[PDB]
Amino acid sequence: AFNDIKSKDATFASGTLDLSAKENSASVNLSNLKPGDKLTKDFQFENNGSLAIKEVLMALNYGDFKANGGSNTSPEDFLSQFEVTLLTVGKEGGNGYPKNIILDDANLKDLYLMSAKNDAAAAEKIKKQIDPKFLNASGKVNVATIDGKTAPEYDGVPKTPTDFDQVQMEIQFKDDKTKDEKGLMVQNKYQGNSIKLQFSFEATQWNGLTIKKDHTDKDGYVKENEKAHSEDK
Amino acid sequence: AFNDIKSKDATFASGTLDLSAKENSASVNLSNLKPGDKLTKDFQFENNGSLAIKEVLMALNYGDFKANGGSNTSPEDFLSQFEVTLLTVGKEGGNGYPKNIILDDANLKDLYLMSAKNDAAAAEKIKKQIDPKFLNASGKVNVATIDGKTAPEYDGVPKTPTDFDQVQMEIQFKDDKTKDEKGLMVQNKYQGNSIKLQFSFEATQWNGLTIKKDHTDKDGYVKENEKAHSEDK
Amino acid sequence: AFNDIKSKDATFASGTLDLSAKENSASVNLSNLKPGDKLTKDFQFENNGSLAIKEVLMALNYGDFKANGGSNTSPEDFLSQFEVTLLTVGKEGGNGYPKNIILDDANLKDLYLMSAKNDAAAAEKIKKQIDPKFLNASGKVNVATIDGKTAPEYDGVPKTPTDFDQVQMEIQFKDDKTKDEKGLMVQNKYQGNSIKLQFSFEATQWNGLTIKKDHTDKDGYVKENEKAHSEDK
């Protein structure tokens, strides 16, 4: 009836990831628009968590339709009259490519349908008129920098190399320009209409990583999780 | 399986534009006319909408031909016997030019043909006998003030500077004065003829404008859309 | 692509003028005349149209020459043997002048030549033997009342003041009284000759009038066109 007991110690901890997503826009809210006008919106993404981000996914949503004086009461019709002219993921950041236009004259009705409802036809049309490599199966659009040939480490706003990503979007109020036989043009129905837009950004983290001696620090913390390309094959 | 969501807000609104087009004429309807008589009509244009007008386009239409006792039953022949003597776009308004006569002894048959049917020959004849700078490809005649050297801001009845445009038109019943061999003059056929005229005014808005920080107000509303020369190059 | 349409209404009408020209003569047709005889013809002019007359112009024409038994076959020679003794434009009408004789022993050959053929010599002779103020460039003779100092409004048989104009003409068969050496007098050639006379009256309207607020009625009709002196300077 002889025995002995030996024990060992081991502590496990988990990291966190946060997204800043500052606006820095010129006006944020615009009113009294007329057809043919062009808008401008900016976004700045920075890392505020221990873990390293991989990409940021953009979603579009609407609400609070008013139709004060127009003859149109369908929010979808009003939203369909706004075309997003360009979406530059590079902007001021000179890492790798200075500026990159992933957009080719898209629309917002299609973007809403393929971003929230995940409609098949809208997704097909967007993929026909957008960069294929900036899309995901979920339907959202990647906005963070990707595939940096000069500096692969500056991919998906990591933390160990201090990186911030600036993106520009240009929104244009399309004019239809078709005159009726009576003499009143059809786009007159969108007079006084007001809509609210919801711009949602989702940040994801990389895949799993097999931890070895080199990846971790001298004791405790792992440094590889804070850097880009942390995931294994 | 870590992620986070960030959202942003944005509201878009559209403006409206309206035209007042008061008459203020002396008699509006005139009867018992005889050849050689001269008429007088007035019009006052004011802005009643959020957006800023660029020009007002005038159209002419007829209807309700009666021919009570005359031997003429063609409305075109009766309409061809009225010449519009003058069309003063300035009138009482002293902004820039006090008075400007854009018309040189025009006719109403030609005006109808080049204003509604858009006939090529009538348009050519009018352009030969009218001011070229007050015309458009659509065929209608601009009536609002334009090219104000003293005050460029008072162009096309804007809203931010309170402007109203007064226009006069003079209509004369032309006499033909050719006597037949029998002794009855030919213009006797237009005795008792009555016609109704439709004076249509169309107000258009400027072209697209690229919105920047200076153009918009402190928050929301844009002031540039309410002023003249809002459109870009 | 914003616009709006405004329209206005306007109706134009034209008046008519008619002449009554009743005869009221004693016998109308006279036969079996002999030299030295005197005739009598009357005319009454009234207004039967919306517009207001200015003057009535008289023309003379002949036809249907027979020469049953005379040795003269020229209608001109037979017509030259009738002298119109007097032409009173006043007659029973007491407005202003009761009676006015515009004629001084005229002839009918000269009247025909200066009224239809518009011969220069006949017109000169008539102007030498007629009142200059009752003539026109066309050559016809004004018959309606003119230049009424007491009542200027009763000029040229207007409509608003109910006026009718009565005119008398006296025709005398002149006797030549020259005896030939054989013993047969020359005027014997005009025996059995018969001629038909055409008395033509033309009514004219005033010149053009610039229509203002006072001239027209409350709505529509213009009253100035129904009154004398409607034309402007």
Author numbering:
A (entry chain B), B (entry chain A), C (entry chain C): 28 to 260
The article reads:
To gain insights into the structure of TasA fibres, we purified TasA from a B. subtilis double mutant strain (∆sinR ∆eps) that lacks the matrix polysaccharide operon eps, thereby producing TasA that is not associated with EPS, as well as the regulator gene sinR, an eps and tasA repressor, causing the strain to overproduce TasA17. We performed helical reconstruction from cryo-EM images and determined a 3.5 Å resolution structure of TasA fibres. Interestingly, this structure shows that TasA monomers polymerise into fibres through an N-terminal β-strand that extends from each subunit into the next. There, this extended ‘donor strand’ completes a β-sheet of the following (n + 1)th subunit, and in this way provides an extensive inter-subunit interaction. In addition to the β-sheet hydrogen bonding of the donor strand with the next subunit, there are extensive hydrophobic interactions between donor strand residues (F29, I32, F39) and the next two subunits. The C-terminal residues 239–261, previously found to be unstructured in NMR studies of monomeric TasA and not present in the monomer X-ray structure, are ordered in the fibre structure and form another inter-subunit interface. Remarkably, we observed that the binding site of the donor strand is self-complemented by a different β-strand (residues 48–61) in the monomeric form. In the fibre form, the previously self-complementing β-strand (residues 48–61) is displaced by the donor strand of the (n-1)th subunit (residues 28–38). The previously self-complementing strand then folds over the opposite β-sheet, and the donor strand (residues 28–38), along with residues 39–47, extends towards the next (n + 1)th subunit, allowing assembly of the next subunit. Thus, the fibre structure is neither representative of cross-β amyloids, nor is it a head-to-tail arrangement of globular subunits as previously suggested, but shares features of both, including inter-subunit interactions mediated by β-strands and an intact core fold of the monomer.
